Amino acid sequence: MTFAHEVVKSNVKNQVLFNGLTTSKLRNLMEQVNRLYTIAFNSNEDQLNEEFIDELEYLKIKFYYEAGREKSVDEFLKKTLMFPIIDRVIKKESKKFFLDYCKYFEALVAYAKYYQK
Amino acid sequence: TKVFKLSFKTPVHFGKKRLSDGEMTITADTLFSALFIETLQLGKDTDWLLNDLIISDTFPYENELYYLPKPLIKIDSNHKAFKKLKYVPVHHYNQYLNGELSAEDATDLNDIFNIGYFSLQTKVSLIAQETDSSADSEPYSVGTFTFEPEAGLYFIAKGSEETLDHLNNIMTALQYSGLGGKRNAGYGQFEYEIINNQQLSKLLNQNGKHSILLSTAMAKKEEIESALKEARYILTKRSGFVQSTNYSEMLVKKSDFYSFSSGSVFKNIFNGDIFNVGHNGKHPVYRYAKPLWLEV
Amino acid sequence: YSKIKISGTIEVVTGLHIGGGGSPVVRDLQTKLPIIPGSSIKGKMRNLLAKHFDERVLRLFGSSEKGNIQRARLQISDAFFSEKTKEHFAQNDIAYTETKFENTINRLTAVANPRQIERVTRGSEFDFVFIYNVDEESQVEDDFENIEKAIHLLENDYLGGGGTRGNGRIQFKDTNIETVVGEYDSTNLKIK
Amino acid sequence: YSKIKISGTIEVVTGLHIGGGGDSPVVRDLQTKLPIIPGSSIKGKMRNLLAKHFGLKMKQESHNQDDERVLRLFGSSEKGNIQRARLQISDAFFSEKTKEHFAQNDIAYTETKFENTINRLTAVANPRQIERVTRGSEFDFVFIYNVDEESQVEDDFENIEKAIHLLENDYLGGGGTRGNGRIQFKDTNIETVVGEYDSTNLKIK
Amino acid sequence: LLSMDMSGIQDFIYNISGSKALKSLRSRSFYLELMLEVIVDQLLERLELARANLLYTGGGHAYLLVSNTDKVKKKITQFNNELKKWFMSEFTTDLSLSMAFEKCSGDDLMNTSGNYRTIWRNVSSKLSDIKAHKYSAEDILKLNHFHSYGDRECKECLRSDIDINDDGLCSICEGIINISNDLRDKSFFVLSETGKLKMPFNKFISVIDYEEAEMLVQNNNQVRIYSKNKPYIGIGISTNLWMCDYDRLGVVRADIDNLGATFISGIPEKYNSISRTATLSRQLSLFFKYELNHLLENYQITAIYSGGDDLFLIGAWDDIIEASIYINDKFKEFTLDKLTLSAGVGMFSGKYPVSKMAFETWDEFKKNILEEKLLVLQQGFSQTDEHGKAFIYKMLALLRNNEAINIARLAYLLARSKMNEDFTSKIFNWAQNDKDKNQLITALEYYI
């Protein structure tokens, strides 16, 4: 799944990235993921609380909405397999996999910020 | 004639001359002193554990290898690598005496010799007028050594079975006090294990014309002439202070004494003796000089 | 003649900072894991308890500088991370040591001067061991009371640097006392 | 010898920006990933304002030497007339009650306030984003005051009470003049933790 | 072939803990060296031999070519006994002299059968045999029986046996401090019956000026002139002895790697003439005692111990590193890339006991780290300010934890800076390579 993490360098075109994706339209996603990450940090056991799961549901809802609002972000989310990994995390209900996902998202975000107009 | 193996888990400072000086191994003198004073703290009878116990110097070990110090024999060839080497594993111990050890072999062994490292700890002292009024703090230094998780020290002892049991008890009791230097400062606790290495046991159980002094010893007055007939040896000045003897510690200090080092080779074996280095004290103070020979 | 062993854990409520290298912190030059050199514990304990008041201090830690030989009755070793803190942090992917940014303001200038202090992480636990060699049966209770007060003071005080400035508060948990040398009972001695 | 404990909570009226980590975040505890108020911040602001309260010379300002009373409270021990510090300011931790409250009502702990700036002769905007601890969140603080001289206790408490009031009207952290970080204290309390010294007549508003 | 050897170089040079570390060590090295010089000169005088007969001195070693007669051997016996008596009356363990000699015919000196190297190795083994048997039965019998009222250790001299008199100061140590003060300004030394330094043959060393040495020539006193590398003097017995006196901290210690082979085997089978290895020794000596003076001019360095194959230098960390590089290059020039040196530099806090610092202690380093990475990093940090130890220290943290997510973190952090894209990309590319990351880490650690 790390090929989707170094694909960001594979998506450096001419001179726009991800068809003009900017961190100004992705800041909301970072804040929402970080908010749930702190809740997962407070959680001690592996088995996630149901309210936390619904939080994941709201997260994916936000993902879909953001993809709807902006096209470059939509390309990012689809081309990086965001929705399948989100559903998988929801399926696994494990904290540790969730932290793995957050790290993946962080790598995506940071690498994206490295390349910007 | 069992041997004891030591683990620390907390660095210990040995030291030769100054608190910032650090060492890996200690000599039989310190060990005898510490075991003796631990007996006195237990308050048992010392005569039994005075003139019957035979102890070696301490020797470093690694995960599964035991070593001995280098015998000062005359080998006729490179004379560079051999100088830099101090300790030899039992595997090739007799091989080196024969001459089987190669220069590259010595290079290899020395390369494996990573059995700990040295460090300097800084400490500050505000018992002075720094806290009381207008003055400065007093930094000083100590030198400490951190053995690898499976590294430590061991000694080779012999005596009667009752002597060995008493030593067992005293060693247990000491396990929780310290050794080395700044014991009370947080250095030098140990848990020990008694292990019988078949190979080392054989090593102690050889017979030959030479003999390797494994301890810090010095013959009596009336044996030295016949002892020094054909030998290769180093003298090692032993000085130091004493604990709860007379009023002023800085006034109390055993006289500088000399003994052979731990790699000497002798032709004529001598028994040693526990020498009094005492004067102007309220009790005699004992320094240890009695050999344990490995006869080859 | 008996020895009493006191082992337990100490928790860093607000980050700890010893820094023997100094702005570093004390480490092992190999393991690179934070340790708290016991002598530091001893020094803080002594300063506190002495400030509580003298013979008793001499009995506890030992000086032998006035011609009176007594020999230390307490041995305090350094401590280390338990396996518990290490495993938790590796699992949760938490760095062991924090780097705090500080700043200082000149007056009549109002300029900024950046500072950096390495603090041990909040919540880590240290396993500590004390050894008390009871040289007098008829005093040990007294001594432990004193050691108790010492521990108690430390509970509301700090170790190391900047303790006025907001670091070094510790806590003591899971203290168990066992007799390990001699045949002296230890079922009634209590330290929190 | 006595040690006196002071407890209470810090209520953020308007957003707080301690922000020592440097976009431009706030200081966070690394075990919980939550905001903290490092005791250096509180203690230093208290010293600064309480010093400014009394007369300070230009030479005193440059050498950081302050008034005898504030200094005795906070300690300099720099040259000559040494004074061991007297009140240890501990850190602040994001209290449990507010953490539960925000979880229950699904409230972020920290906002990213967007701000702008109009440079002159260009009128051109250059934006910025700044993190602020959400208002109404509560920190727990602990102060430990030591009695190095029994005679002076109420006077030292009155001094730190004035510093507490000064902090409430002013601000901590950054953006203080721009609106960030006015705070208030709530549920203060005093209890003698060590010694035999009563603390009932003591009060801090 | 006669040879001499001091026993106790390191420990006696290295038990210094006082506040005069530079002043102490600089004089201690000189003192031991001069003890060697006075010893050998006394010997050469006794054998009625010429100063030419000395062939090499260095470390504690010295070599001479003397006659094969019985009387000579008796004299050698007597002198050796006397010297041992003096040292034992002095130090008893800290310093001793062992002397050994071997019979030879010049035919072997003609490298006739390559037996010149054999006699050299034989005398080396003989020297080690004398080192082993240092004292007799009666010697040590006195040694272990000497209960004497003594005071305590000289704070400068970590030694108990010698007797402090006032302010915790003994006598020999006190003279060491005095000669240190006069070592820089005054350059002339004189063997006198009354002096501040105690010499083995019941003699004393003082320091004088060139005019005082001329006055001693008019006095016709039994004096010898010992110098600070002063040539073209021609004043009485103008002996130009060689000693290199030039003046956190950095300490660099270096040793010739292939010096054991060079001194004996050197050139095989055809140029192993006694004169020829002598001239090799001569060149090495002159280099190590003259170029070491000359080259050090531009470095904030004081020369502490130079000679034989041992280089023990202390100074400013950056200056120490730079001069060490300079010295390696200069050596590789002067040795024509034939002899190599191994050297180490350690950074130690000031006011440390140097006796503990000493026991602590190429082209790859020069070209790659210093020449390439260090300069570009320096230029970048020159171009972008505010990048204090905070920014660099975050870099260090990022590098020190070698994990891929840390690679991403390093990328983002670099992005938040404002350094030229080429500079940030070079740092990122260097971080990717394990070797280049280790090199960049080293360069930046040097940066502070």
- Residue spans of the domains in chain D: they are 1-205
Alpha carbon distance, N-terminus to C-terminus of chain D: 26
CA distance D17 to D33: 16
CA distance C99 to C118: 5
E373 is in an annotated binding site: no
CA A90 to chain CA mean position, Å: 13
Contacts of B201 (CB under 8 A, 6+ apart): none
Neighbours of E235 (CB within 10 A): 15
CA B258 to chain CA mean position, Å: 15
Q: Report the gap between the CA of C134 and the closest CA in chain A (Å).
A: 43
CA distance E222 to E42: 12
- Is residue B121 within 8 Å of residue B144, measured between CB atoms? yes
Cβ-defined contact of B131 to D84 (cutoff 8 Å): yes
DSSP letter (8 states) at residue E149: -
Neighbours of B29 (CB within 10 A): 23
Angle between helical axes of E389-400 and E434-447 (0-180°, round to 10): 150
Q: Shortest CA distance to E288 belongs to which of E124, E57, E97?
A: E57
The set of chains that have 3 or more CB pairs under 8 A with B is C, D, E
Contacts of C6 (CB under 8 A, 6+ apart): C129, C130, C131, C132, C175, C176, C177, C191
- Is residue E246 within 8 Å of residue E301, measured between CB atoms? yes
CA distance D192 to D6: 9
Cβ-defined contact of B176 to C37 (cutoff 8 Å): no
Contacts of E100 (CB under 8 A, 6+ apart): E2, E3, E123, E126, E127, E129, E130
CA distance B288 to D154: 65
Contacts of E278 (CB under 8 A, 6+ apart): E55, E56
Query: Residue C95: closest CA among chain E residues belongs to which residue?
Result: E401
The residues facing E148 across adjacent strands are: none
Q: Which of B42, B183, B247 sits opposite C1 (nearest CB)?
A: B42
Q: Shortest CA distance to E43 belongs to which of E92, E2, E6, E95?
A: E2
E402–C contact, CB cutoff 8 A: no
Contacts of C32 (CB under 8 A, 6+ apart): none
Q: Report the gap between the CA of C25 and the closest CA in chain B (Å).
A: 12
Supply the Cα-derived Rg of chain A in whole angstroms: 14
CA distance A106 to A100: 10
Contacts of B111 (CB under 8 A, 6+ apart): none
Selected for mutation to probe chain A from C84, C87, C89, C92 (highest A CB count within 10 Å) is C92
CA distance B296 to B265: 10
DSSP annotation string for D31-90: TTTEEEE-HHHHHHHHHHHHHHHS---HHHHHHT---HHHHHHH---SSSS-----EEEE
Cβ-defined contact of A38 to D99 (cutoff 8 Å): no
Residue type at position C57: V
Instruction: With residue E214 as reference, give the H or E element that holds it.
Output: helix E210-219
C69 to chain B: which residues are within 8 Å by CB? 243-245, 249
The total number of residues shown for chain D amounts to 205
Within 13 Å, how many C-alpha atoms sit on residue E228's CB side? 17
Q: Report the gap between the CA of E132 and the closest CA in chain B (Å).
A: 5
DSSP annotation string for C130-143: EEEEES-GGGHHHH
CA distance D153 to D147: 7
D109–A contact, CB cutoff 8 A: yes
The number of C-beta contacts closer than 8 angstroms across B and C is: 67
Cβ-defined contact of A110 to E409 (cutoff 8 Å): yes
- Is residue D185 within 8 Å of residue D8, measured between CB atoms? yes
CA distance B251 to E150: 10
CA E297 to chain CA mean position, Å: 18
Contacts of D79 (CB under 8 A, 6+ apart): B134
Mapped to the 3 state alphabet, what secondary structure does chain B carry? CCEEEEECCCCECCCCCCCCCCCCCCCHHHHHHHHHHHHHHHCCCCCCCCCCCEECCCEEECCCCEEEECCCCCCCCCCCHHHHCCEEEHHHHHHHHHCCCCHHHHHHHHHCCCCCEEEEEEECCCCCHHHHCCCCCCCEEEEEEECCCCCEEEEEEECCHHHHHHHHHHHHHHHCCCCCCCHHHCCCCCEEEECCCHHHHHHHCCCCCCEEECCCCCCCCCCHHHHCCCEECCEEEEEECCCCCCCCCCCCCEEEEEEECCCCEECCCCCCCCEECCCCCCCCCEECCCCCEECC
DSSP annotation string for chain C: -EEEEEEEEEEESS-----S--------TTT---EE-HHHHHHHHHHHHHHT--HHHHHHH----SS-----SEEE--EEE-HHHHHHHHHHT--SEEEEEEEEE-TTT--EEEEEEEEEPTT-EEEEEEEEEES-GGGHHHHHHHHHHHHHHHHTSB-STTTTTT--BEEEEEEEEEEEESS---SS----
Q: Shortest CA distance to D167 belongs to which of D4, D8, D3, D28?
A: D8
The residues facing E204 across adjacent strands are: E192, E198
E78 is in an annotated binding site: no
Cβ-defined contact of D109 to A41 (cutoff 8 Å): no
CA distances for A55 relative to A85, B32, C156, E361, angstroms: 15, 69, 40, 59
D204 is in an annotated binding site: no
- Is residue E270 within 8 Å of residue E206, measured between CB atoms? no
Within 13 Å, how many C-alpha atoms sit on residue B139's CB side? 12
- Is residue B123 within 8 Å of residue B139, measured between CB atoms? yes
D64 to chain C: which residues are within 8 Å by CB? 107
Q: Which two tokens stand for residue A27?
A: 């800041």
Q: Which of D1, D3, D43 sits opposite C165 (nearest CB)?
A: D43
Q: Which of C21, C39, C180 sits opposite B185 (nearest CB)?
A: C39
The set of chains that have 3 or more CB pairs under 8 A with A is C, D, E
E124 to chain B: which residues are within 8 Å by CB? 79
The residues facing E344 across adjacent strands are: E253
E67 is in an annotated binding site: no
Q: How was this structure determined?
A: cryo-EM
CA distance D42 to D52: 15
Q: Which two tokens stand for residue A3?
A: 């090929």
Burial environment of residue B81 by CB neighbours within 10 A (0 to 12, 13 to 18, 19 or more)? middle
Cβ-defined contact of C99 to E397 (cutoff 8 Å): yes
Unique residue bearing structure tokens 């109002």:
C110
Q: Which of A27, A31, A41 sits opposite D33 (nearest CB)?
A: A41
CA C6 to chain CA mean position, Å: 13
DSSP annotation string for E265-323: TSSTTTS--HHHHHHHHHHHHHIIIIIHHHHGGGSSEEEEEEETTEEEEEEEHHHHHHH
CA distance B63 to B151: 6
Q: Which of C1, C29, C76 sits opposite B117 (nearest CB)?
A: C29
Selected for mutation to probe chain B from C6, C30, C49 (highest B CB count within 10 Å) is C30
DSSP letter (8 states) at residue E371: I
Instruction: With residue E399 as reference, give the H or E element that holds it.
Output: helix E389-400
- Is residue B116 within 8 Å of residue B7, measured between CB atoms? no
Cβ-defined contact of B122 to C20 (cutoff 8 Å): yes
A114 to chain E: which residues are within 8 Å by CB? 411-412, 414-415
What ranges make up the beta strands (E) of E144-291? 188-192, 197-199, 203-208, 225-226, 238-239, 249-256
Burial environment of residue B280 by CB neighbours within 10 A (0 to 12, 13 to 18, 19 or more)? exposed
Helix, strand or coil, per DSSP, at residue E52: helix
Q: What are phi and psi of D189, to 5 degrees?
A: -165, 150
Q: Shortest CA distance to B20 belongs to which of E355, C75, C20?
A: E355
- Is residue C9 within 8 Å of residue C174, measured between CB atoms? yes
Planar angle of CA D63, D66, D68, nearest 5 degrees: 135
CA distance C100 to D40: 11
Q: What are phi and psi of C10, to 5 degrees?
A: -125, 130
CA distance E314 to E14: 14
Burial environment of residue E16 by CB neighbours within 10 A (0 to 12, 13 to 18, 19 or more)? buried
278-337 of E, contacting B, C-beta below 8 A = none
CA distance B75 to E128: 11
Q: Which two tokens stand for residue E367?
A: 């070209």
The residues facing E255 across adjacent strands are: E310, E342
CA distances for A93 relative to A51, A88, D106, E137, angstroms: 11, 9, 20, 84
Residue type at position E213: A
C54–A contact, CB cutoff 8 A: no
DSSP annotation string for chain D: --EEEEEEEEEESS-B---TT------EETTTTEEEE-HHHHHHHHHHHHHHHS---HHHHHHT---HHHHHHH---SSSS-----EEEEEEEE-HHHHHHHHHHT--SEEEEEE--B-TTT--B--EEEEEEPTT-EEEEEEEEE-S-TTSSHHHHHHHHHHHHHHHHS--SS-TTTT---EEEEEEEEEEEESS---TT----
Counting other chains too, the contacts that D39-42 makes at CB distance below 8 Å and 24 or more residues apart are D39/C14, D39/C165, D39/C166, D39/C167, D39/D88, D39/D89, D39/D90, D39/D91, D39/D92, D40/C102, D40/C162, D40/C165, D40/C166, D41/D172, D41/D173, D42/C166, D42/D89, D42/D92, D42/D141, D42/D167, D42/D172
The total number of residues shown for chain E amounts to 448
CA distance E195 to E204: 5
Contacts of D76 (CB under 8 A, 6+ apart): D64, D65, D66, D82, D83
CA distance C10 to C7: 10
Q: Shortest CA distance to A87 belongs to which of A108, A64, A115?
A: A64
D33 to chain A: which residues are within 8 Å by CB? 37-38, 41
CA B87 to chain CA mean position, Å: 14
CA D112 to chain CA mean position, Å: 22
Query: Residue D80: closest CA among chain B residues belongs to which residue?
Result: B134
Instruction: State the binding site of B for ATP.
Output: 80
D34–A contact, CB cutoff 8 A: yes
166-225 of B, contacting E, C-beta below 8 A = 218, 221, 224-225
Q: Which two tokens stand for residue E42?
A: 């006394």
Helix, strand or coil, per DSSP, at residue E94: coil
CA distance E49 to A101: 88
Contacts of D110 (CB under 8 A, 6+ apart): D26, D35, D131, D132, D133, D134
Instruction: With residue E348 as reference, give the H or E element that holds it.
Output: strand E341-348
- Is residue E204 within 8 Å of residue E198, measured between CB atoms? yes
Planar angle of CA E16, E19, E25, nearest 5 degrees: 45
CA distance E412 to E425: 12
Q: Report the gap between the CA of D101 and the closest CA in chain C (Å).
A: 23
Yes or no: domain E247-368 corresponds to CATH 3.40.50.1820: no
CA C64 to chain CA mean position, Å: 23
**Resolution stated for this PDB structure, in Å:** 4.4
Write b or e for each residue in E340-374: b if 16 or more Cβ atoms lie within 10 A of its Cβ, otherwise e: bbebebbebeeebbbbbbbeebeeeeeebbbebbb
Q: What are phi and psi of B178, to 5 degrees?
A: -105, -170
Neighbours of E137 (CB within 10 A): 15
Supply the Cα-derived Rg of chain B in whole angstroms: 20
- Is residue D63 within 8 Å of residue D115, measured between CB atoms? no
- Is residue D117 within 8 Å of residue D126, measured between CB atoms? yes
Q: Report the gap between the CA of C21 and the closest CA in chain E (Å).
A: 10
CA distance D184 to D11: 5
Residue type at position E354: V
Unique residue bearing structure tokens 């094969």:
E68
CA distances for B265 relative to A107, B260, D183, E63, angstroms: 67, 10, 81, 29
CA distances for E11 relative to B226, E8, E62, E161, E188, angstroms: 31, 6, 20, 15, 28
D74 to chain C: which residues are within 8 Å by CB? 164
Write b or e for each residue in E59-75: b if 16 or more Cβ atoms lie within 10 A of its Cβ, otherwise e: ebbbbbbbeeeeebeeb
- Is residue A110 within 8 Å of residue E412, measured between CB atoms? yes
CA distances for D70 relative to B24, D66, D102, angstroms: 52, 7, 39
- Is residue B280 within 8 Å of residue B290, measured between CB atoms? no
- Is residue B294 within 8 Å of residue B214, measured between CB atoms? yes
Dihedral of alpha carbons C45, C48, C53, C54, sign: positive
118-157 of B, contacting C, C-beta below 8 A = 119, 121-123, 126, 131, 146
* Whether E and B touch (3+ CB pairs < 8 Å), yes or no: yes
- Is residue B98 within 8 Å of residue B122, measured between CB atoms? no
Query: Residue E418: closest CA among chain A residues belongs to which residue?
Result: A114
CA distance B254 to B250: 11
Q: Report the gap between the CA of C171 and the closest CA in chain E (Å).
A: 29
